[PDB]
Amino acid sequence: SGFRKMAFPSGKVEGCMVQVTCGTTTLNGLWLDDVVYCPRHVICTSEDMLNPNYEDLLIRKSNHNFLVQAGNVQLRVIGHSMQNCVLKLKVDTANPKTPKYKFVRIQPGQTFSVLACYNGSPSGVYQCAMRPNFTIKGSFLNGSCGSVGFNIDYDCVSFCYMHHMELPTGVHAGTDLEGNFYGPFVDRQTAQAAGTDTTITVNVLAWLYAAVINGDRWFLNRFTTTLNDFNLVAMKYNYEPLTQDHVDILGPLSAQTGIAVLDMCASLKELLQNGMNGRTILGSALLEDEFTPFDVVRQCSGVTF
Amino acid sequence: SGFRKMAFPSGKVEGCMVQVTCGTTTLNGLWLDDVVYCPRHVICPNYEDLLIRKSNHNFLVQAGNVQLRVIGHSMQNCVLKLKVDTANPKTPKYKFVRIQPGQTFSVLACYNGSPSGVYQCAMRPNFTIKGSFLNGSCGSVGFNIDYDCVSFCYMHHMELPTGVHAGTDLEGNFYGPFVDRQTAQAAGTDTTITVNVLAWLYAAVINGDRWFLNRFTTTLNDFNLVAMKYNYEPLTQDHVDILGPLSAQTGIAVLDMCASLKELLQNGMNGRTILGSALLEDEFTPFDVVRQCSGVTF
Numbered sequence: 001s002g003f004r005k006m007a008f009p010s011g012k013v014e015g016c017m018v019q020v021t022c023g024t025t026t027l028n029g030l031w032l033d034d035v036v037y038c039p040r041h042v043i044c045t046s047e048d049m050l051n052p053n054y055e056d057l058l059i060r061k062s063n064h065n066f067l068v069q070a071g072n073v074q075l076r077v078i079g080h081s082m083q084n085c086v087l088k089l090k091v092d093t094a095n096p097k098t099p100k101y102k103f104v105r106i107q108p109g110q111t112f113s114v115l116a117c118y119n120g121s122p123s124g125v126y127q128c129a130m131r132p133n134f135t136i137k138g139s140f141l142n143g144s145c146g147s148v149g150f151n152i153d154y155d156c157v158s159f160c161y162m163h164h165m166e167l168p169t170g171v172h173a174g175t176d177l178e179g180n181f182y183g184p185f186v187d188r189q190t191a192q193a194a195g196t197d198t199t200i201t202v203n204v205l206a207w208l209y210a211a212v213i214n215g216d217r218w219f220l221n222r223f224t225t226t227l228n229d230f231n232l233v234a235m236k237y238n239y240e241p242l243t244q245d246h247v248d249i250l251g252p253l254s255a256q257t258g259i260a261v262l263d264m265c266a267s268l269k270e271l272l273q274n275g276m277n278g279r280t281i282l283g284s285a286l287l288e289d290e291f292t293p294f295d296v297v298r299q300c301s302g303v304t305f
Numbered sequence: 306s307g308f309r310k311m312a313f314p315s316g317k318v319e320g321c322m323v324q325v326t327c328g329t330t331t332l333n334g335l336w337l338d339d340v341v342y343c344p345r346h347v348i349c350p351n352y353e354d355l356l357i358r359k360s361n362h363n364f365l366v367q368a369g370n371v372q373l374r375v376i377g378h379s380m381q382n383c384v385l386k387l388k389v390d391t392a393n394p395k396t397p398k399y400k401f402v403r404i405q406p407g408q409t410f411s412v413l414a415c416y417n418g419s420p421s422g423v424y425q426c427a428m429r430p431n432f433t434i435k436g437s438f439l440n441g442s443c444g445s446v447g448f449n450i451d452y453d454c455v456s457f458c459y460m461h462h463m464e465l466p467t468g469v470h471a472g473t474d475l476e477g478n479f480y481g482p483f484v485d486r487q488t489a490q491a492a493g494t495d496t497t498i499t500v501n502v503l504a505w506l507y508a509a510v511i512n513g514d515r516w517f518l519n520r521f522t523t524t525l526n527d528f529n530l531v532a533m534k535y536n537y538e539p540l541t542q543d544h545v546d547i548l549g550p551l552s553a554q555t556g557i558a559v560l561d562m563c564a565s566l567k568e569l570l571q572n573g574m575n576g577r578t579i580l581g582s583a584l585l586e587d588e589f590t591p592f593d594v595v596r597q598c599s600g601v602t603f
């Protein structure tokens with residue numbers, strides 16, 4: 001019993017964290033085999049960030065301008081190349097602690113663990129979701145750039161995010177491990193604002209099924225809804241549209257609890273209308289949207305209470 | 306910016322997790338040097354009588370794909386200590402410490418000696434933890450990290466009827482009036498960790514959330530009379546002293562913040578949130594706030 005925001009064990013990722021210094025800038029790098037991956041803005045000054053020409057800044061650099069530190073050992077850089085917004089530093093030593101891994105690009109609504117690092121040293125781990133506006137509501141300070149997001153289903157680490165920047169509203173933006181940004185963001189200090197954020201509907205529904213599995217049904221009603229009627233209501237509360245794919249994905253949880261997806265949708269409609277009336281759902285007074293259908297199935301018991 | 310329930314990096318603890326099987330029971334063990342620590346209920350009660358019948362070969366210990374050979378066994382309170390023939394080469398620098406209610410820690414939830422998740426939690430005033438554990442989670446451990454040293458503070462033993470969890474320190478002493486057996490055991494009425502709510506209100510101020518601040522202050526006694534009424538733990542002078550650094554950083558005295566907390570208790574949030582929460586959060590200590598709003602590394 002119980003339901004917590006659970007992160008994956010960070011050990012496999014901790015063994016890959018290094019410190020990258022280029023001039024006066026120091027940030028984090030990911031050391032996998034003989035390559036260190038880090039944000040390309042490590043080659044920038046603060047002044048450069050307004051309108052940086054990364055190709056012009058990079059051509060003026062040699063291998064020995066990049067200092068890479070793994071614990072107390074200095075790694076020797078023997079090559080460098082840029083792939084989108086990430087710098088790839090070829091080092092002379094392969095990481096003996098390289099886990100089995102893949103680079104995966106995630107979609108909004110997907111969750112992942114973040115190992116927040118400073119000076120190549122991990123300081124904390126927390127669970128996140130890629131928001132619909134492509135930002136993450138993280139906890140990052142200056143020096144955290146290069147910190148990574150990941151999932152560890154089975155024994156393989158799937159790296160999905162690398163931290164690049166903080167936006168004016170306190171939220172964060174970054175890239176996949178191929179250097180492609182999530183969202184319409186640039187690694188430039190320009191007028192960049194996160195688009196209006198919305199609630200991840202399929203995740204709130206999954207969390208309502210997790211509440212039913214843990215023995216709570218006070219929020220259920222005797223009504224059902226069409227998919228279109230649900231979306232017309234939910235759009236009024238800044239909720240993401242629920243698609244047929246979302247309904248299909250919620251299939252297993254519907255069969256486990258005996259509550260049809262559109263009947264759970266009717267219950268969500270009523271919660272949006274009434275609020276909780278001093279009650280909580282899984283210890284929360286707000287509707288939780290950072291647990292996917294897959295996270296609920298992984299954490300919760302296979303037997304409904 | 307941002308404020309998340311952050312756990313310590315779990316790597317140093319992951320390298321210590323093993324699977325312990327005794328008969329039909331399978332649970333988790335902590336392998337440090339040549340000793341595996343696990344809940345004594347793995348032998349299940351008269352624990353001296355059940356243990357005397359057991360031999361070393363009755364205990365199967367598995368570390369990854371390798372079977373460890375048990376060469377000795379002894380009991381310390383509610384913890385079984387299995388002497389193995391191999392020292393853990395991944396043993397970190399460590400201490401066994403007993404925590405107080407209100408203090409927080411990270412939990413590496415494990416099943417079959419394999420870590421599956423990590424989460425942060427607090428020891429409640431009623432000595433239970435609001436964890437997320439399923440059957441097979443027994444032997445999962447709680448810890449904190451200071452520089453390079455792992456301080457083990459909790460080992461999971463059981464789930465109570467209300468869904469909350471009970472366990473021991475690494476010396477086998479239970480937190481709370483609990484026993485390791487099947488009987489009528491219930492968690493006592495819980496209270497809110499006042500010093501932690503105040504720390505979280507300072508974290509909100511640091512992150513730019515000040516709507517709850519007012520021009521008023523309060524005496525410690527007046528605040529405590531109000532706290533006793535909302536099932537909040539009494540705030541002591543030690544708590545006020547511990548909140549000293551956060552008070553100097555934000556310019557808001559502790560009894561000034563206590564006047565804000567009194568108003569939030571008597572009038573609610575009025576449809577507003579604090580750090581994305583509609584409830585007053587009590588599972589972040591003053592030290593956790595200082596650490597997360599300063600970037601301390603391990």
Ligand SMILES: N#CCNC(=O)CN1Cc2ccc(Cl)cc2[C@H](C(=O)Nc2cncc3ccccc23)C1
Nearest residue numbers: 041140141142144164165166167168187188189306
């Ligand atoms: N608003 C705002 C923050 N902007 C700055 O104070 C300077 N930053 C400009 C800038 C512009 C673009 C890019 Cl790609 C990178 C950067 C860098 C950046 O965003 N780093 C940071 C990442 N995460 C958390 C942080 C918290 C506090 C301070 C800096 C953080 C430094």
Ligand SMILES: [Cl-]
Nearest residue numbers: 105106107110
């Ligand atoms: Cl995805």
